């Protein structure tokens, strides 16, 4: 085994060889030279990240105040309009004309139900809606089990028809506005503009079971947040059909709950245990509810019924005050069949003043006495609900919000506050969106205070979407580098706006569906959960980020600079990036907005080119017939002008881009000058490289392909044969290697993938990249990232000439940080190139981490898909490992032993690059396995919830809670 | 009532209406087995 100085001297002649090959062939110092040679085609402006945040915080203020004004007027009209409605019952005499969504639009149908008359609308196709729509009226959604033509429903479509004039007045004023909808108390919803619903009832074989009342946006503006507590009666009498019904009501009751709502679930049979692991009221987020809905299911009925120990346990649960709580409506609901005891004594003290509200549910078909339960409900200002059937569950476990809304409708104007929802997928397929809601109240005869019998309910709730693609147009990231971004946050820790946030729903648990019990054609529910990713789950968690995260939940302003490690774009690397954060509150709302920058991004380039010939000359550089002397040029699909659209077929896009500058001068009076201009300047900078430097050295021996991925989207792979293999995203702010090249001050090597499809190994090769780094007036800039795809065959020859190809004495390999295998001496390994090195000899890799040579961090990706397990895709959690050098020390000697054998490995790290060289004795001499240490998205179901909630994350609830008005009717059950 | 009282706790959603839960109902069920009518479908609920 060679000495430590021989490995030292032999690494230094093959890290000097790779870097000279990459410093020379790519042209780092040449592209630095021509950014500095000009100085005057551009100027260098600063990103004032105090100022940028303040500017952004105000476009989201004004956007969400403009939405709010529209909401207020609609509400006023609805209140005024229905106070002048007459309650007619002759509807076959005077037809109600409306367009009904989810109905066949074929003219020849002509069903013509009594009372109603439909509309055939004309349906232009649209952008900002990715569906055909009509701007002349509002559609109407009736849920499926609700009959339309009922006097109760027919009378909504009469009075609600005056909203189409106010609907129209909102979009005339603001073209950008998205869905406008009124969700009725009656269960009928009207939205503008009209479009056909996505599931028709019976024209396909999937049938929608969508109810407006059920909806989260409808619920948050229906009522105030609430600490509920479900009691379940588990006595012996319940076992049977009735027990079956209860498990489906509680799961149903929960759907109703929200993050702001706290909830626990207890159960009694002569003792009250608590159904799961929790013991206090927990946040009723997606996870906690998933635990409770998984413990409600396993319940077995046995034993004597005791309503006294069931309501003692409930009240005690209600009084914890140590835990984090909603502290608003306090209510307890019991599911039971029949009661012989009213438990008068427990209610006298625990709730002598009736602070708590009791709702009693009688379920199943049975003969047990319901008088005592009704009495309990009446005594406590709750309500009573029967459920005999499965189809009766859905409208009675949502109906309690008519009771809880009462002291809000007695609060008057004070209760008309806009609230904005958690991001969620739109019913109509719009994408991620948030809705601002306002409740409409039933005011009839207010002038004189004549009735009030049913004047304590809301007419319904009114909402208006903001799409998250509308907010991302108020937070522009182009001046800032790929590293910089804006993050938005609730007072709940959830992230409103984040690079990491994705359309797929956030998943819980490992998905298990039983194929042996899905009959083929019945169509179960798909999903309704909100997409609540948290800030400490969108990014790698620190302790110096939980400080930042708490500090901008409680509405403060500030900046912070620290060293933290960024997870890479692809999930394979972790790079220590020195960042600065800066946050401020959006003053109209409860959102607070932040901005990450990396020091060195504090300055950007603005293009200062305006000459006729110079913008002209740089623009034919990106012509696809002129790639024989330029290099297969790419271009990023920014929204350059409003007219040319991002196309995802890039040769399509670059023609429509470059047609645009010929057919019209780049002045373009409805199009931003700087973004297009910077691109033009850039293409004259990645031209002078490809003309005056790369086309001189037309073939370097080991060099396969040469790229300049730059800022302005223009990536230039140098031979067109090589550009067929360029499998990157052509958007330069989505490339992984672009972003890892900017963090590092040394050449970076990217490992090719293992297996997969497409040619990514011998054909393209392993790639090196390096950020260009210029200084203008003593101000650091990193404009571009040069690079090289390496030839893996040639590199091997230099490497071979104490390692002999296929040697049985000892094997040596080169590994980039992250532990991926780039080069293998044996060749039984270099076939499996770009593979995680702990999968080809897991014994050595395990030891290396122990020596402190390597470090890692497992994280959770709450938005990913996986195949089900037997117990096409669902959402699930994956755990993800990344590996990264944590020790700066250059060399590491030692020996590892498996038991009865020693192997002496020597590790040396090449200077000036992330690569590491290790020499070790052949694996075959000691037959050892430990277990195969693998690095992949690995399906898992963590973290366990029962341990998170003992020390929950900081949170801030709603300031205004409406409950317990003294003059509430409290007489109807 | 002793053999089949409170023993029909099946978790199906179907109606087994000739059961043995009260005394009036038990008496009615007993009468239905003497008239012969559908007497064996009353027995299958008692084997299950
Ligand atoms: C042998 C005679 C048997 C008489 C059975 C009988 O009288 O049942 C009385 C029973 C009363 O039950 P209940 O209403 O709960 O009152 C109990 C006292 N607090 O009532 C019942 O449970 C049903 C009684 C039906 C009697 C039918 C008589 C005609 C055969
Ligand atoms: C709810 O439906 C009823 C029935 O269609 C609507 O009442 C109708 O309202 C219109 C305009 O308010 C009435 O038109 C007027 O008719 C009189 C003659 O009757 C004429 O002198 C006026 O110049 C005008 O043309 C219509 O007659 C009336 N129908 C009845 C039976 O009274 C009502 O407008 C609908 N509510 C909402 C909010 O849309
Ligand atoms: C808003 O509140 C008002 C009352 O404050 C509600 O109006 C009431 O609606 C009921 C519906 O059951 C009407 O009662 C019906 O009366 C007819 C006679 O026309 C009778 O045939 C029915 O059997 C039933 O009793 C009642 O007339 C009406 N009250 C008033 C004062 O107009 C209204 O329904 C609420 N708004 C919404 C959208 O529900
Ligand atoms: C958000 O609103 C606050 C006030 O509630 C603004 O703070 C003010 O800032 C101005 C100068 O910008 C000062 O003159 C005032 O004294 C500040 N307010 C108070 C009460 O001291 C803040 O600038 C706003 N920020 C944004 C982004 O809109
Ligand atoms: C992420 O990895 C880093 C390794 O660099 C971890 O940081 C070290 O954590 C240990 C305890 O696990 C401390 O003793 C060291 O002082 C830390 N070193 C540095 C440089 O921070 C970090 O804990 C990991 N994060 C998680 C969540 O495991
Ligand atoms: C005590 C009880 O019956 N609860 C069961 C538990 O025993 C079981 O381990 C779990 C998973 O099957 O489901 C629940
Ligand atoms: C298409 C194909 O052959 N895929 C294979 C896969 O079966 C195998 O498990 C893997 C080894 O990690 O190599 C690859
Ligand atoms: C900051 C830190 O931990 N540095 C250590 C260093 O002290 C040690 O000499 C080296 C070799 O083990 O590993 C690293
Ligand atoms: C895995 C292995 O080789 N274990 C060896 C065994 O073969 C040998 O018989 C024994 C005595 O020398 O020592 C140990
Ligand atoms: C191998 O060594 C030769 C001679 O020093 C050098 O020209 C070549 O670039 C090296 N291989 C590479 C490209 O790493
Ligand atoms: C808000 O409304 C005003 C007035 O219609 C308009 O000028 C402005 O552009 C709107 N802002 C946003 C972000 O929609
Ligand atoms: C982080 O900050 C220190 C001190 O300002 C600086 O020396 C270092 O270069 C920064 N980190 C990186 C990766 O540049
Ligand atoms: C290093 O390995 C030793 C022996 O296997 C073990 O006791 C120790 O915990 C390891 N160090 C770390 C940091 O895990
Ligand atoms: Ca009971
Ligand atoms: Ca017969």
PDB file of C-alpha atoms in Angstrom, chain A residues 236 239-241 243-245 247 367 390, chain B residues 6 8-15 22:
ATOM      1  CA  UNK A 236     -72.488  -1.926  24.247  1.00  0.00           C
ATOM      2  CA  UNK A 239     -72.381  -1.846  18.652  1.00  0.00           C
ATOM      3  CA  UNK A 240     -74.168  -2.780  15.468  1.00  0.00           C
ATOM      4  CA  UNK A 241     -75.299  -0.585  12.599  1.00  0.00           C
ATOM      5  CA  UNK A 243     -71.441   1.987  15.798  1.00  0.00           C
ATOM      6  CA  UNK A 244     -70.653   1.767  12.093  1.00  0.00           C
ATOM      7  CA  UNK A 245     -72.347   5.127  11.504  1.00  0.00           C
ATOM      8  CA  UNK A 247     -66.951   6.254  12.846  1.00  0.00           C
ATOM      9  CA  UNK A 367     -85.492   2.500  19.946  1.00  0.00           C
ATOM     10  CA  UNK A 390     -74.904   7.276   5.412  1.00  0.00           C
TER      11      UNK A 390
ATOM     12  CA  UNK B   6     -79.468  -7.902  21.626  1.00  0.00           C
ATOM     13  CA  UNK B   8     -78.474  -8.827  15.993  1.00  0.00           C
ATOM     14  CA  UNK B   9     -75.742  -6.206  16.216  1.00  0.00           C
ATOM     15  CA  UNK B  10     -74.664  -6.780  12.641  1.00  0.00           C
ATOM     16  CA  UNK B  11     -72.755  -3.978  10.987  1.00  0.00           C
ATOM     17  CA  UNK B  12     -74.664  -4.218   7.744  1.00  0.00           C
ATOM     18  CA  UNK B  13     -76.953  -1.432   6.743  1.00  0.00           C
ATOM     19  CA  UNK B  14     -79.823  -3.793   6.081  1.00  0.00           C
ATOM     20  CA  UNK B  15     -83.014  -4.239   8.060  1.00  0.00           C
ATOM     21  CA  UNK B  22     -88.631  -6.400  23.010  1.00  0.00           C
TER      22      UNK B  22
END
